[PDB]
Amino acid sequence: VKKNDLFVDVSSHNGYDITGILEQMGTTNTIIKISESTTYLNPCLSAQVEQSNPIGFYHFARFGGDVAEAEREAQFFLDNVPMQVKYLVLDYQDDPSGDAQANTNACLRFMQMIADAGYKPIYYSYKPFTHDNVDYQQILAQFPNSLWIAGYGLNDGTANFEYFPSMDGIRWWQYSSNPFDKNIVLLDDEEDDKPKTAGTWKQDSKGWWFRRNNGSFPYNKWEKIGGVWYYFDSKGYCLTSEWLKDNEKWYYLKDNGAMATGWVLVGSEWYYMDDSGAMVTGWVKYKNNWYYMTNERGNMVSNEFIKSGKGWYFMNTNGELADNPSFTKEPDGLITVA
Template sequence: MRSKIMLGFAVCAGLFLCGQNVQASRAQGTDLSRYQGYTAVKGQASDEFAISQIGGINSGGIYTQATYQSQVATGIAQGLRMHTYIWYQVGSDIFKAKQCMDYFLPRIQTPKNSIVALDYEDGASCDQSANTDAIIYGMRRIKQSGYTPIYYSYKPYTLLHVDYKRILAEFPNSLWIAAYKDYSVTTTPDYAYFPSMDGVAQWQFTSCYRAGGLDGNVDLTGITDSGYKNGNPEKPETHTPAVDAGIKADNTPKRDISVGYTVKVNYSASRWTTGQYIPSFIKGNSYKVIQVSGNKVLLDGVMSWINKSDVEILQATAPVQSNNSSYYTVRYGDTLGGIAYRYGTTWQNLQALNGLSNPNWVYPGQRLKVTVNGYAQRAYTVRRGDTLSGISARLGVSVGHLVQVNRIGNPNRIYIGQRLVY
């Protein structure tokens, strides 16, 4: 999630679990947005679930996450129970809440009964009761659509802006609360810093689940089993295109890997087929297969051969397409910056993508290309003193992702003025 919870917040939250049996599940997992890329990532090898952002609503209106469906598919392929969350910056505005639910609920790609969480951590009004009405409205719509509604935020924000007892009266054990001990890499929750509240089903206990940053969550009640038979991601209660693609990938034997498949390099892999050591930044990242020869495959971007036994299949078909439209029709009052924000890109990228000589010259009815191959395109121009690792940290993506999408043969060779897509 976007919010960062300070140590003091966690301490003030209380040191003991209140009315909560934390022995119920304790499965751990992550939450993901576009910053993690198109492949679901694990923080720890033992992770059992992930919650992917489909998009949301903010002061600029509805926006989507091009990474959502692909994350769901590749998460299922890795054995994760996949769920959904929505950025819910509606304040107390029921009209915005309805607009958000009308748009996103038909587009959910996780199974029926899976979690659909409302991320409410910004934009609250001064009217606590009206804020709570807007949240309950959204949760009712989620439940009516056949999903498991939960509320995400952190304790101080909730106590100030929301009557969470009203939420629990209608939706027991439906809170997902964030509170961090500190910002050190933390792989397991320290229950001395649990945000003591009634009804906490899930706790986000760190934003540093691994080096480089990733949210870590613990399921306290078994709520992440929702939508999955006996908690098995291969046996969801219902199917969607993204889930079906993930199950197909998981069930495809490695001997059947073909050109066009997406695979992940296993952490246990040690050498390319040429005998050279595989760099650590390659491991755990996903790559397209561009050639197959016997028991080895050639990976796009790194242009290296690897044994089929050293990879894991993430997508056995073409990537699941996002619901994003490739084009946007300009409406009255639109600006290029506002359109770019909605699609998770920059106005400079849209200007270049559409060949606009002046970014201020957009007009109602104009048709703008907003995505490339279904995904919003973002780019960074290399400056003096930059390194690929430094750029990856600044952009919130992995070195391996930059290497892959920019087809970089040697990650130590980048140059001033080079344009890196991320």
């Protein structure tokens, strides 16, 4: 998954049919509960897996500050993972011991067992619980960017960045439980596959071209090189800092030639590209600010509305803000956080 992707988490609380909540959310990405303690299994696991695309599984911790109990819980969890996924989650939100270091050590032992078994461990909780009951900096020191943090705000079912939990190392954010658990991704998945560059980049007077191993070079085409998409013009030079229209969609090649995905700064304006590089039009939010972007006839426009107080103010061409808010009721557009 990538920045701003969505996923839902489920347990027996969601039943044997989750197709409705997946349709409502607009994704099949799930993290599904397997286990709790050393004896309880979510009986909906098989049904929930069949109906979705799991990106991970979770375990509801009951071990408190007991490291030996933590090892047993982790093994029970591991023994019941039904399919390969990148992530296994430690859900630590109840029954803490009175000793925060013991709780931390137990969580680290659990997460280490996950890592040793060949998965990426994740620590899930909410902010005040973590602050009172563990030392999360010790968790991050052993497992970087491993947090999945819940913070729902007013819990109205949308992601409201004003209530974004402020913690280091957050990978995912559970932004609502209304009416089911909703999540948004803050960091792309780590890529542990070092891409290969099948040739050598050459710079001449005109620009950069790519000499493939066979001595040829890409021209009039997209080509992926060392994991990154580039577009090469008719003479074999990769485009840099340029808009490109391909099959009725708009792409932006960055100053280093790489195809932009996600938010990209073009001059002084912000545009948003999906994960396939294609520009997204209409309303898109970044953190607290709203943008209405269009590309009618290749006229690229990014209308910026800066939040201040309970209003959003249009920023004019001179960088000047309206005296009074343009709107106070937010548009129902695409919400991003990274």
